[PDB]
Design an enzyme around this catalytic site. Structure first.
Site, PDB file in Angstrom:
ATOM      1  N   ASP A  33     -12.529 -62.078  75.815  1.00  0.00           N
ATOM      2  CA  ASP A  33     -13.730 -61.570  75.188  1.00  0.00           C
ATOM      3  C   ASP A  33     -13.474 -60.445  74.210  1.00  0.00           C
ATOM      4  O   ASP A  33     -13.208 -59.297  74.648  1.00  0.00           O
ATOM      5  CB  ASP A  33     -14.580 -61.100  76.425  1.00  0.00           C
ATOM      6  CG  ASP A  33     -15.846 -60.498  75.912  1.00  0.00           C
ATOM      7  OD1 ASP A  33     -16.541 -59.793  76.689  1.00  0.00           O
ATOM      8  OD2 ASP A  33     -16.301 -60.634  74.738  1.00  0.00           O
ATOM      9  N   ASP A 213     -17.363 -61.703  68.293  1.00  0.00           N
ATOM     10  CA  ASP A 213     -17.407 -61.665  69.794  1.00  0.00           C
ATOM     11  C   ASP A 213     -17.215 -63.038  70.445  1.00  0.00           C
ATOM     12  O   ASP A 213     -18.170 -63.812  70.589  1.00  0.00           O
ATOM     13  CB  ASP A 213     -18.849 -61.080  70.011  1.00  0.00           C
ATOM     14  CG  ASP A 213     -19.054 -60.833  71.499  1.00  0.00           C
ATOM     15  OD1 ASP A 213     -18.200 -61.116  72.364  1.00  0.00           O
ATOM     16  OD2 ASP A 213     -20.108 -60.248  71.797  1.00  0.00           O
TER      17      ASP A 213
END
Ligand SMILES: CCOC(=O)CP(=O)(O)[C@H](CC(C)C)NC(=O)[C@@H](NC(=O)[C@@H](NC(=O)CC(C)C)C(C)C)C(C)C
Ligand SMILES: *[C@H]1O[C@H](CO)[C@@H](O)[C@H](O)[C@@H]1O
Ligand SMILES: *[C@@H]1OC[C@H](O)[C@@H](O)[C@@H]1O
Length: 323
Positions: A33, A213
Site C-alpha cells: 500500500d 495509492d
C-alpha cells in the site's frame, strides 16, 4: 547493488493486489500500500478464531520484541488494526531487510476479520507517517533503499493478470515510450502530485492534487468531477447497496484523463467498468466520490493504466502507459 521483482496478483474484481513476503522464514500474502507506512501482519497474538484462514507470523519464533512499543492505525474506509512490535528479517522479491520493524496485530476491525485474501499490509508511503510509538520506524523501502541500485520502486498493476513491483530498477519493457516525471509533495507523507487539468469524456476542467495509492481500489475524485463524469453515462444512478454510481454493464463509458507535467495519463473507459455491482444486473463505476476530503485518490483503477515509478530522489513520480 540489490534489486528484485515481486509479483502481485489481483483478488476477485481487482479489489486488492497481494504479493508474497517472507518474514522470519514464513511467507505471508500482503497488500502493498503506497498510501500508508506500516508493515503489519496477522500474528499468533490474535484470538485463534481470527487467525483462521490466514498465514500468521509468530513473533516468538524469530522476532526481537521492542519492549514498550505499540502501533495503531486507522484507514480511510474506517478499518483499523493495532498491536506490538518486533524486528525481523523481511524479504520481498529476493531483497532482504534485516531488522525491519514488523507490526504484529493484536486487534483487527471486522473488515480485516472478513478478508481472507491478505495477511496484513506492507506500507510504502513515506516513513514520516509510520504509526509506531513512541518512536516511528522505517518502511521496508526506507530500510533497504540505500542498498538498492537506485532508490526507487515501480509498479505495474493489471486487470485480472499478475503484475509486478520492481525494487531498485526500472523495467523499460513494462511501458511504452518514455517516462514523464512530476514533483512529489511528501509533506503529509504521501506520494502526492499535481494535475494541471482533466478531461472526463466531453468535459474538461481545472487541475487538483492527488495521491498515488495502491491500497485503494477505485479512483476517488471530487463530487463535482464525479457528477460531470456520470452525467454522460446513460442511466447511471447511485446505489448505496453497491457503494456508489452503477450503470448497465454494457454501457459505453467515456475515458478519463489528467494532464501531468505535459503528459496525458488516460484511463480508458473499459477500465472504469469495475465489475458487477453485486446488486442485481448493474456494474460499479471505477470513479466514485472522495467524500469531500480536498484531494483525489489515484487508486488501482487509475494505476491499471500506467507503469508508475516512485523515486525517492526529488522525490518524484514517473508515468508512462503500460505496455
Ligand atoms: C494512511 C491513510 O490512507 C488510507 O487509508 C488509504 P489506503 O490505501 O492505505 C487503505 C488501505 C486498505 C487496505 C484499508 N485504503 C482505504 O482505506 C480505501 N479502502 C478501499 O479502497 C477498500 N476497497 C473497497 O472497499 C472495494 C470496494 C470499493 C468495491 C479496501 C477493501 C481496499 C478507502 C480510501 C476507500
Ligand atoms: C536488479 O538490479 C541488480 C543490480 O544491477 C541486479 O543485480 C539484479 O539481478 C536485478 O537486475
Ligand atoms: C513473479 O516474480 C518474478 C517474475 O518477474 C514474475 O514473472 C513472476 O510472476
Amino acid at each position: 547493488a540489490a534489486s528484485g521483482v515481486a509479483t502481485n496478483t489481483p483478488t476477485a474484481n481487482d479489489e486488492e493486489y497481494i504479493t508474497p513476503v517472507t518474514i522470519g522464514g514464513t511467507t505471508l500474502n500482503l497488500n502493498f500500500d503506497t498510501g500508508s507506512a506500516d508493515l503489519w501482519v496477522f500474528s499468533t497474538e490474535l484470538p485463534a478464531s481470527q487467525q483462521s484462514g490466514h498465514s500468521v507470523y509468530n513473533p516468538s519464533a524469530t522476532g526481537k520484541e521492542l519492549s514498550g512499543y505499540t502501533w495503531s492505525i486507522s484507514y480511510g474506509d474506517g478499518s483499523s488494526a493495532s498491536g506490538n512490535v518486533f524486528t525481523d528479517s523481511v524479504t520481498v522479491g529476493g531483497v532482504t531487510a534485516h531488522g525491519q520493524a514488523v507490526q504484529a496485530a493484536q486487534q483487527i476491525s471486522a473488515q480485516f476479520q472478513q478478508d481472507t485474501n491478505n495477511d496484513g499490509l506492507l506500507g510504502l508511503a513515506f516513513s514520516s507517517i509510520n504509526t509506531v510509538q513512541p518512536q516511528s520506524q522505517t518502511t521496508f523501502f526506507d530500510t533497504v533503499k540505500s542498498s538498492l541500485a537506485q532508490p526507487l520502486f515501480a509498479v505495474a498493476l493489471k486487470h485480472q493478470q499478475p503484475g509486478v513491483y520492481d525494487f531498485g530498477f526500472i523495467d523499460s519493457s513494462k511501458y511504452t515510450g518514455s517516462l514523464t516525471y512530476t514533483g512529489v509533495d511528501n509533506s503529509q507523507g504521501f506520494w502526492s502530485f499535481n494535475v494541471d487539468s482533466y478531461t472526463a469524456g466531453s468535459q474538461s476542467g481545472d487541475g487538483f492534487s492527488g495521491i498515488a495509492d495502491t491500497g485503494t481500489t477505485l479512483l476517488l475524485l471530487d463530487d463535482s468531477v464525479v457528477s460531470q463524469y456520470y452525467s454522460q453515462v446513460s442511466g447511471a444512478q447511485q446505489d448505496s447497496n453497491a457503494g456508489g454510481y452503477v450503470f448497465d454493464c454494457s454501457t459505453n463509458l467515456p475515458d478519463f484523463s489528467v494532464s501531468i507535467s505535459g503528459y496525458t495519463a488516460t484511463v480508458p473507459g473499459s477500465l472504469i467498468n469495475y465489475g458487477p455491482s453485486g446488486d442485481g444486473s448493474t456494474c460499479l463505476g471505477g470513479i466514485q466520490s472522495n467524500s469531500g476530503i480536498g484531494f483525489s485518490i489515484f487508486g488501482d483503477i487509475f494505476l491499471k493504466s500506467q507503469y508508475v515509478v516512485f523515486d525517492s530522489d526529488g522525490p518524484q513520480l514517473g508515468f508512462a502507459p503500460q505496455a
